[PDB]
Design a protein around this ligand. Sequence first.
Ligand SMILES: NC(=O)c1ccc[n+]([C@@H]2O[C@H](COP(=O)([O-])OP(=O)(O)OC[C@H]3O[C@@H](n4cnc5c(N)ncnc54)[C@H](O)[C@@H]3O)[C@@H](O)[C@H]2O)c1
Ligand SMILES: NC(=O)c1ccc[n+]([C@@H]2O[C@H](COP(=O)([O-])OP(=O)(O)OC[C@H]3O[C@@H](n4cnc5c(N)ncnc54)[C@H](O)[C@@H]3O)[C@@H](O)[C@H]2O)c1
Ligand SMILES: Cc1cc(C(N)=O)ccc1-n1c(CCC(=O)O)ccc1-c1ccc(-n2ccnc2)cc1
Ligand SMILES: Cc1cc(C(N)=O)ccc1-n1c(CCC(=O)O)ccc1-c1ccc(-n2ccnc2)cc1
Ligand SMILES: [K+]
Ligand SMILES: [K+]
Ligand SMILES: [Zn+2]
Ligand SMILES: [Zn+2]
Ligand SMILES: [Zn+2]
Ligand SMILES: [Zn+2]
Lengths: 372, 373
Amino acid sequence: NEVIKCKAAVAWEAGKPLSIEEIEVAPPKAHEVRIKIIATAVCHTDAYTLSGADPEGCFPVILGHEGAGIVESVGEGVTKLKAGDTVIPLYIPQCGECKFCLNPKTNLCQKIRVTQGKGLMPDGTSRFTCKGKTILHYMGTSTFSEYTVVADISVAKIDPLAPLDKVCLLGCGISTGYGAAVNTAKLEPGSVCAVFGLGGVGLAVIMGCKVAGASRIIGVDINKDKFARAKEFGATECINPQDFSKPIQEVLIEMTDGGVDYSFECIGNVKVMRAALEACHKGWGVSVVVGVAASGEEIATRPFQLVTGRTWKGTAFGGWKSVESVPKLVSEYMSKKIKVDEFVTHNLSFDEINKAFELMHSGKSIRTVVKI
Amino acid sequence: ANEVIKCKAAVAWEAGKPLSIEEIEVAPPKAHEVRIKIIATAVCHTDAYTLSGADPEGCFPVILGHEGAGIVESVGEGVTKLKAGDTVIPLYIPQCGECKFCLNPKTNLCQKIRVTQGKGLMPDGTSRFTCKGKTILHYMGTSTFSEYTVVADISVAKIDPLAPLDKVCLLGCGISTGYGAAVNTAKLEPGSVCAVFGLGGVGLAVIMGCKVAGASRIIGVDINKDKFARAKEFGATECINPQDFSKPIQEVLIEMTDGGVDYSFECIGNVKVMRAALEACHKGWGVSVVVGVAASGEEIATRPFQLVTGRTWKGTAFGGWKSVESVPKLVSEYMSKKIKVDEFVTHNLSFDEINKAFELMHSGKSIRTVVKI
Ligand SMILES: NC(=O)c1ccc[n+]([C@@H]2O[C@H](COP(=O)([O-])OP(=O)(O)OC[C@H]3O[C@@H](n4cnc5c(N)ncnc54)[C@H](O)[C@@H]3O)[C@@H](O)[C@H]2O)c1
Ligand SMILES: NC(=O)c1ccc[n+]([C@@H]2O[C@H](COP(=O)([O-])OP(=O)(O)OC[C@H]3O[C@@H](n4cnc5c(N)ncnc54)[C@H](O)[C@@H]3O)[C@@H](O)[C@H]2O)c1
Ligand SMILES: Cc1cc(C(N)=O)ccc1-n1c(CCC(=O)O)ccc1-c1ccc(-n2ccnc2)cc1
Ligand SMILES: Cc1cc(C(N)=O)ccc1-n1c(CCC(=O)O)ccc1-c1ccc(-n2ccnc2)cc1
Ligand SMILES: [K+]
Ligand SMILES: [K+]
Ligand SMILES: [Zn+2]
Ligand SMILES: [Zn+2]
Ligand SMILES: [Zn+2]
Ligand SMILES: [Zn+2]
């Protein structure tokens, strides 16, 4: 395999638009896979890292972690994947061998986390160069490029008939929200639910709640424009905290004769995380933190809330063991068990990638799919 | 029932003062009430919390006590499942069997009588206690610091009539709570690695539960090293003192378990330690159970990263036991030697020495002191 010259959206520094550049992509080393990215989407954390607020965000970097494509080539020792395979790259890998992969209670494979956090392949180097400069990887995926290189354990092999301009969304938001409901919460039929934040993650939670047979699904958002789509996904009603003088947890307790069976925070706001917990019913209430708060911020409550029977938990990528689960999720979409198309609110070409960031900031999008 | 009973009780006349052995009057039970002759009672931390005046819900004068065992003296109108002579433990968490909570297998927090109970009253909104012309309040629905108490009929567990009441009184709170925290709330699997913060009666019962469930490691944590010997006797595989280390206790535990424990239990009531107990749990699957009851208004905190990376924060009340059905089963486990009770009794006193039990509790020298009425 040879060096590939191709287009990528490079973030040279924080707080600036992405630069469409000509880059070089090195061939895959041992146990690496080079992927032709066919479609990618833009998510909140891409923007967060780009802003410079991320304490562990480093530049220059090729962002992007919601993608789908085709294996261009594989490195030495790779036998399970081959050129032509249809794939989704994974920011949570599955080595299948570490104590985390071997434990049915978690999906947090630890094999490559240190190098990945530093924007590096497992051997401690990057495959990206541009204008004489090394360009860092992001979240083990770097999908904002015509070609990326990932660890061989960061790859889900999927249905070759899957529409890649849709299933790229199973790389993050949809899988996370859906899994929060069905894996982390494991909510029972008839459950009363509250979902805080009605972006793609929140909608996917609602979707999961409906699949699980929830009786009541209350969407909560400060942006009432989000309500229509939430109802389409199955929210039985929607409320705006701004419309009430009382704290949102008191409103929810009032509405539900004690609080919800399950709540989901899909914002990353620590005050709302507390509200979501306190909005849960005494005795059996469970709150799942899905939102990723800014570093240093703390969640708080009175321990009485736990002693009186509420449970606080969280989720990472919906708890899915990624390599085994993502193909199954693609199969659920193909069989119309779950929705994917309904999350796509905008479509752009690669050169227009910055407009996807603009759409996010405005609050006008769920997911924008960028066609490479 | 029958008539008014004139007996002795330990009255708390006022916050911040010792208990006074007074001559009191105990009214006969009304409909769906049960009058119990208390044979043995013990003193628990929350009795002192209320006595101190620090409890915003504490009201005086009051007859305290909620760990007790006795014999039914008489029953009110409409009571059929209990009769004079039945061997019983009074329950601060009742089980009406009919409310939303009783009907839900995930909880034991019966709500049937909680409002009146919170006010120190029977379900009809009145007290059965008087002393020197004054109304004396009930406490935790139990008021065990009396020769005779009256409780709601849903606040009674009928137990093995061969059970020694100077031992099984302890199943009315501490032992049951700790044991249940392990086997009910955590439901730990065989082979689990556990940490127990606080090595009083509650912590010891957690250790007992972890051993019953087949934990591979049980790490006891206490700033009082005098607690270590009994903790090991109960099944602690090792014991550590936070004061012996320069770094936070959660870092210490992560180091000794290669990532953190599978299950942690806070058995103190300290919000800083509660955070530490959560953070000492293993990434991905760790579970921390809050058992300690913190002072009012105090808050627990952590970074949400701790939950997003797979730790779970829970709590428990009376070990999650649906009380009326479970406490007799817990007595049976004691009688069959599946669980320990006798080993929790470190001191024994007479009723007129009840204040010494409080002294022993605050000096750190006791686990449980049983007071013989
Ligand atoms: N845990 C994981 O594995 C994981 C995976 C993907 C995304 N996330 C996180 O999930 C969160 C949501 O992602 P998204 O793509 O849906 O974002 P989004 O911006 O599209 O949606 C967030 C929504 O929250 C609403 N909101 C903001 N403040 C609110 C408040 N005070 N009360 C009620 N609603 C409020 C906004 O109006 C918005 O609609 C982000 O924090 C993201 O980082 C976590
Ligand atoms: N949740 C419930 O239903 C329930 C039921 C019974 C008791 N409790 C609570 O459980 C807690 C413990 O009860 P107990 O009877 O065992 O009390 P205890 O006072 O006998 O035991 C507490 C132990 O914690 C230790 N300790 C104090 N600070 C510490 C620290 N910083 N680090 C490590 N250890 C520390 C003390 O040395 C003591 O041995 C109390 O708060 C009590 O109210 C709760
Ligand atoms: C999965 C992940 C990747 C990175 C990274 N930079 O590669 C940083 C944090 C996380 N991360 C971890 C740590 C995983 C571990 O330690 O094994 C737990 C949860 C996350 C995580 C962080 C962010 C998101 N996220 C938010 C929006 N889109 C994806 C999803 C998951
Ligand atoms: C069970 C109990 C009794 C009283 C009371 N004073 O009667 C107050 C709080 C609680 N309580 C509640 C009630 C909340 C509710 O049901 O809505 C939940 C948990 C408790 C509770 C309070 C204190 C203790 N405790 C601490 C030490 N010994 C017993 C154990 C449990
Ligand atoms: K569940
Ligand atoms: K368990
Ligand atoms: Zn994302
Ligand atoms: Zn692994
Ligand atoms: Zn009830
Ligand atoms: Zn107690």
